[PDB]
Design a protein around this ligand. Structure first.
Ligand code: NA
Ligand code: NA
Ligand code: NA
Ligand code: NA
Ligand code: NA
Ligand code: NA
Ligand code: NA
Ligand code: NA
Ligand code: NA
Lengths: 599, 599, 599
């Protein structure tokens, strides 16, 4: 009996108190400790060497306790550790072993989930230092790392990076690096208050699968000029993605350096998220340097139904090569996104774009293999002052991209800066169902709406359709003489173009090519013969040898004659058609025509 | 030892029984009470003054117990209170203090989540009375209220409003009012069986952020003629939304009064939901009266990938003004929705529409500032008998709206009732990729498919394309003489129009305007001169002074001559072209032409 | 006191140890057993007849214990049973009673949820036998079954089917059959390693509502040639769907037999999912045989924003009839999907398609009633070698289907095999905004891009637009003489067609029909009269009696004359136009024209 009181007060006491669920005679006859052992929290490991519980706080380093918890639960085949609500748990030292090569704090282990209901904060030990808060690699060399499987982090809690700036631009900082990660996820968590490189990374160079970030918040994760670059989630394994997240930055530096998501492997997605205050929406890129685990192709890439206010580019496409591997990007869909460039001065952040075809990280524009991309059903808006805003900035070689049924309301439709790169363009398709807005009407002095500053364009379609006037622009579409153009279709619808001096401009006369199909409006001066009755009219100028037919876009204010309704050409480059002189006389008129070639 | 038995049976007993997790020697030496204290339920507060547990039931008011639980957990920095499964917990009185001004039952508190696994019912004390079941305001005056932060309500449970009708139309009833709410959400819950104004409201006049309703059900929440108006979720803070919910009504009154969602602040969404039995899908509105917390602009508004059977309008757009604030709506996307008007008689519910540009709550149509809206990739269907069905009912001033690649199968495409409002319309864009269905073919006697009953139309595009015949309609598009039309493009594709007497009708001759670009089919009678050889044909009528060119849509059944293939005009308003008389003679023919002006 | 030690060690011991939450004097004075009774796990029933806990393992059949748990919790109004993490729980026998008719293992009960954190495996007792692991029917005859309501299965755990092959093709195997299921769901679970017919089925012949599968994984669920057919989720009740799931197969048999989802009742969806290794994406079908619970119409069907690599067809549409019921499919949207046919030889799996209009299960093609379908904003790709790849394989009667703003990059656009079925086609709409890719350029010898192998086509639109050349194809569009064509619009844009011998081909001369509206390019030889001045040119051939106008697509390399720019016809079927002879002489030219009829 002495001994009984002793047992009951001992740590084995609950193991002596019987329990049967709801007094049910068919239930297991258990002990209290058995039922308590079905759950586990940080409190079960957050104790001193004598087993006395330690209270968390700014002057307590919780790291070793949390690691002990993870280690122990891992040893039993897994489970879920709760990080209790109503407490802030500070981390105040680096981890040891395999994660030290990654500046790791906590090592994640397979099947061991974390339910973060309270707050995890970084203590000032980490000020000006690199860190990766949770790491799933088990080796300093990721190539020699084991996998992390079935690890979920979820809850209503918070990871707070303590506000600390980077100490040097070369440093790396991360929230969760799942590593070579298979069926891992983060759900519900708020990441906030730091200066970091990534909040979450999924996979490693294509090793991993089925990793997701869902219903998380990322708030104020860049705060300094030291921060070299920030991408909030970096998706580096296939069959993985980001859904229904919220991303916000307030720093000025974030407007120049921060991107919300990167998709770097096949069968990856970015959907249903809201972004504010970032430079960029998403990179969609196949790096040859990352091709080890899942091949050299990024395909089935999806960016859909997101909402964004950014300062630079919404989606950036890329692929590149190494000495022995070539990366390819194909089968991409960008749809349903509503995006705007936030209020800013022209040229005060990276050049505004809905899509950017960017050069590689060395600036090379002749290594890319990007094709079979569909951009459909998106809206884009930039305020009227933002000269540096385009539907697509096409700055590197492009093997195809298709635009259907978007609404683009910005300075340029297609742009690339002259005397920069000279991309080779194939299979650029701009369907007539793309609606060109009018916010930048009157701002386009000296500018071409479609500024085709490329080395060459083949197998491309540009069907221009205005929906309001903008007589300030120099042309709707212009090809410099250095841009070859072949096997293409280029049309300018006449609506809102009557008063334009230039509609389509071919500075090398490239619309003459055998397999170029074009149409655009032009003003033409004609003169007739004197004959009464059916009578020819001929253009005064001889620059129409390429024209297959033309037809009037002007009314005839005369009674005594009419010019031809339709024209063909002659070998000397004149247009010619048959009009009617009710009364004879040489006539001379200036008419707006629709010039057509092979259409 | 006497004393030990006593301690063990006392309420401090579990605090004397030791426990160490899984017998792990490195785990904390705790007491049973410590582990039990990691969770909390309603049972921990649902007790009489002596501490004896009280069973819930229809004759027990659970309100004070649940409030006590919330209050206590709030005092510890938060946590999650479970509302146990297998019990119905009745609420039978009003709350006190700050929530009394809101007819509040329970006051929510920051960081205190509710996991509702059982059922919460309203007792008949609430019959014919106002109530707001859960309220996050802490003051009767919302302007003087504190915030609610980090409050989540979730579970497999149920909030049941007891079936009670409203007592007076002026009363308000709500399920959850989060208040000035930051990172709050409702997930998984079924709201059912009532007559209420809202089930959930998020935010207050733009104060709040990151509030969401996800995977909830709302069933039968209007049941009486007294109910003035019902909107199931009212989103009144930015960076907030509704995703993957189910909404159903069976009441006849709901078909006239109920809307599923309202989006009232920037960066808000409504996605992936299913609606049946409601009048309306969503309001997307910037009320000046609600502009305090987040500015005067609603932008980045998203309605996507929903499924609906409604009786009135799917999306209703609006903005309005007060004495000192002006509200603006811009940058909206409506995409991927599949919607139909349910079976009903014509005019038996509010006028059926996919989009409605509605007047303000006072009926004013000259205060709105709505622009940069994209409606793309949606389907809409109304049964053939529903005369009052339109793709857009445009009833108030519109500063722009763009339709691309939709499928609209209803009575009207564009409509506004004559002798009602006379909206000023700018930047209405109806792309040719909008497919017009054929359900209402043969029903359109006396009606114009595009009925342009506006004060004026500028910078607009209407590209009509039929996909089957409907010879019952009076015209494809008609402009009354009171509607000014300028700087616009209006086209009628000829397919399925050969037999139409009227295609495009300009009752004020507005197609003559200098910057109007049109084309449409017409039948024209021509007569030739007698000359053998090339010979002019001239229209008998003189109403073509606006025509820039025309071309034949008819075959020539003659051998001895041919009419012109193409025509221009003359100053007297005749058309003229050059045909061919193999043999001489005056000819007289009636031809279907495509009339063109500046296109 | 003797007696006290005894009570404490007994199974009623925890019922004698007092507890009050956090020492709060206003909290309930409870006993430890009360707090433990708030949760329940399998361990509470996994015991021998004496109440001693049994360890799970390969040689322990856990079935009776899990059933006992479900039964008991059901008796208390429900709750959630945990299936503990860190253990595999084997099932090794069949259930008894109502579920025996369904080869059921476990019977689900209303309000009793399962939180599966560990693993559930099938023992080899099930090798070569039928089984349905969890069944919600309570009767062997589903027609006499009660309902299952409010049953959720969720967690990070796993259902493993043990790898066992089917014993006979006629056998059925399933993971979860919810039965006549109302507010039931599966969330988070991994189904893997089997040879089964379905993983999950929702509803029964239209009985059920609000059933969902969310964030689950289905991995390797076909493994044998015996397996007759596999569809991973079969949705057989309305207001139900599949969201954000992952489906993968590696078996060769799956490429021929497996589909990811079937939608079989109204108001159902399939969204945001990733599929690899399957034959098919989704069936969307109204079976008359399944019309009992929710009517004879499947409407509001949504397939959106999915990512797929399949070997056969992405979406298959269907409806059929029984002796007394007729099934109808209408109001369908397919949008935002990015799909490809995986690498395979031509004809090595079922014919590749984005959409298939399939015959019924008996092969009948004259029973379907499918209409009001919108296919918009999708991408589809098949590798160049896959002859058997189409945007739509149209193999049964079709009452309407609309394609807007897709990107299809495969061998055929519209296809049906000749001398197979002869479908009746109405309201097939192929908008010009559909972009036709170029992967299969040069592969189309002998083939028609749009191969119209139908009994008849009415009220249809085909607007062909190429975006690169493919001179290998026999035609862009061909109608055999056996296909009637009326009240339709068929156009071939001229871009990339100059060198094509055949563009549109009407083998029965059907383009002559009164209400056929067409345009396409053709080469025509003309001869003029000798007259100096305005002079007629006439076609040598007489096959143009149907032509309403034509215009030049060729330049004029002559100085001394010009052919007409535009032409009409004459009764003998010649074309005729007026050109100009600067000098006299009979001229003879070959010109590319755009032939037009009523457009
Ligand atoms: Na490192
Ligand atoms: Na493409
Ligand atoms: Na060049
Ligand atoms: Na009030
Ligand atoms: Na717009
Ligand atoms: Na007016
Ligand atoms: Na059976
Ligand atoms: Na349709
Ligand atoms: Na036939």
């Amino acid at each position: 009996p002495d001994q009984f009181r002793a047992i009951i007060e001992s740590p084995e006491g609950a193991g002596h108190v019987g329990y049967q669920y709801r007094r049910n005679t068919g239930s297991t006859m258990r002990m209290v400790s058995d039922v308590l052992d079905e759950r586990v929290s940080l409190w079960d490991f957050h104790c001193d060497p004598s087993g006395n519980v330690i209270q968390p706080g700014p002057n307590v380093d919780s790291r070793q306790y949390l690691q002990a918890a993870i280690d122990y639960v891992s040893s039993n085949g897994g489970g879920t550790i709760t990080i209790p609500a109503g407490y802030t748990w500070y981390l105040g030292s680096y981890g040891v072993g395999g994660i030290a090569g990654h500046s790791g704090i906590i090592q994640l282990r397979s099947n061991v989930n974390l339910n973060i209901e309270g707050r995890i904060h970084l203590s000032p030990f980490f000020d000006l230092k690199p860190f990766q808060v949770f790491v799933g690699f088990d080796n300093g060399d990721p190539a020699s790392s084991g996998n992390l499987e079935n690890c979920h982090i979820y809850g209503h809690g918070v990871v707070d990076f303590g506000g600390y700036e980077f100490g040097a631009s070369s440093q790396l900082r991360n929230g969760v690096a799942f590593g070579r990660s298979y069926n891992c996820s983060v759900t519900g968590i708020t990441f906030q208050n730091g200066d970091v490189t990534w909040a979450i990374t999924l996979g490693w160079n294509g090793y991993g699968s089925n990793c997701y970030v869902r219903k998380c918040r990322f708030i104020n994760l860049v705060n300094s000029s030291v921060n070299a670059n920030h991408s909030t989630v970096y998706v580096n394994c296939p069959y993985s993605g980001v859904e229904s997240c919220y991303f916000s930055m307030s720093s000025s530096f974030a407007r120049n350096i921060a991107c919300s998501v990167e998709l770097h492997q096949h069968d990856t997605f970015y959907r249903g998220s809201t972004v504010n205050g970032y430079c960029r929406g998403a990179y969609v890129v196949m790096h040859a340097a990352e091709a080890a685990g899942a091949g050299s192709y990024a395909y089935n890439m999806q960016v859909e139904n997101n909402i964004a206010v950014i300062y630079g580019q919404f989606v950036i496409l890329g692929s590149d090569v190494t000495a022995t591997v070539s990366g390819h990007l194909n089968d991409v869909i960008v749809s349903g996104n509503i995006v705007s460039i936030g209020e800013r001065a022209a040229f005060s952040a990276p050049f505004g774009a809905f899509i950017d075809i960017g050069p590689d990280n060395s600036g090379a524009s002749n290594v890319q293999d990007i094709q079979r991309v569909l951009v459909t059903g998106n809206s884009f808006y930039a305020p009227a002052n933002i000269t540096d805003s385009a539907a697509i900035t096409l700055r590197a070689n492009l093997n195809g991209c298709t635009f259907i049924a978007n609404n683009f309301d910005c300075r340029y439709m297609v742009y690339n800066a002259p005397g920069t790169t000279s991309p080779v363009v194939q299979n650029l398709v701009w369907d007539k169902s793309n609606v060109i807005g009018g916010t930048h009407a009157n701002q386009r002095a000296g500018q071409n709406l479609f500024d085709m500053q490329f080395a060459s364009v083949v197998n491309s379609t540009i069907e221009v359709q205005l929906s309001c006037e903008d007589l300030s622009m120099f042309s709707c579409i212009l090809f410099p003489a250095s841009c070859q153009l072949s096997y293409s279709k280029i049309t300018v619808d006449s609506a809102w173009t009557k008063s334009m001096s230039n509609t389509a401009v071919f500075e090398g006369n490239q619309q003459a090519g055998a397999n170029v199909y074009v149409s655009y409006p032009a003003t033409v001066n004609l003169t007739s013969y004197n004959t009464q009755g059916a009578v020819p009219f001929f253009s005064t100028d001889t620059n129409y040898a390429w024209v297959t037919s033309a037809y009037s876009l002007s009314i005839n204010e005369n009674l005594d004659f009419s010019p031809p309704a339709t024209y063909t050409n002659k070998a000397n480059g004149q247009l010619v058609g048959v009009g009617y002189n009710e009364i004879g006389g040489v006539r001379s008129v200036s008419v707006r025509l629709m010039l057509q070639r092979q259409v």
